Design a protein around this ligand. Sequence first.
Ligand code: HEM
Ligand SMILES: CC(=O)Nc1cc2cccnc2c2ncccc12
Length: 106
Amino acid sequence: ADLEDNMETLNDNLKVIEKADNAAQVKDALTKMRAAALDAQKATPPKLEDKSPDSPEMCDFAAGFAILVGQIDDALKLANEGKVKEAQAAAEQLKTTCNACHQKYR
Ligand code: HEM
Ligand SMILES: CC(=O)Nc1cc2cccnc2c2ncccc12
């Protein structure tokens, strides 16, 4: 998909996880998020469209999602051990990485 749809997915599923009743729900959402994270990792954001893929800015962008995925995976790992609560805790922490990048590039 494209970037906006990716960020929708990311946002919706983050709400789901806040809302989640069991571990399968959370595993599911996190899995959806992972997919979008990775898709988005190769999109070129509007604000950066005039910069070469080489640039500090574009690399930083892509690094964002590298961090984002890693954190998702830590949460995935937690939801896999059935630890719904600690896993929602980890999703909350995502919000940091969202904002940090939104600050720079949204
Ligand atoms: C899981 C955490 C994240 C959530 C919940 C999230 C959600 C959102 C939302 C709701 C929007 C509104 C824009 C729209 O829908 O049209 C948006 C836009 C945007 N986000 Fe994220 N995002 C997250 C992480 C990130 C990260 C890590 C980056 C950079 C690495 C990023 C970069 C952007 C950019 C560039 C836009 C603007 C898109 C446009 O101009 O069309 N986001 N995001
Ligand atoms: C941040 C950065 O250095 N990106 C890249 C830098 C690259 C520099 C030379 C050749 N390929 C790349 C490249 N290819 C795929 C994805 C990213 C890159």
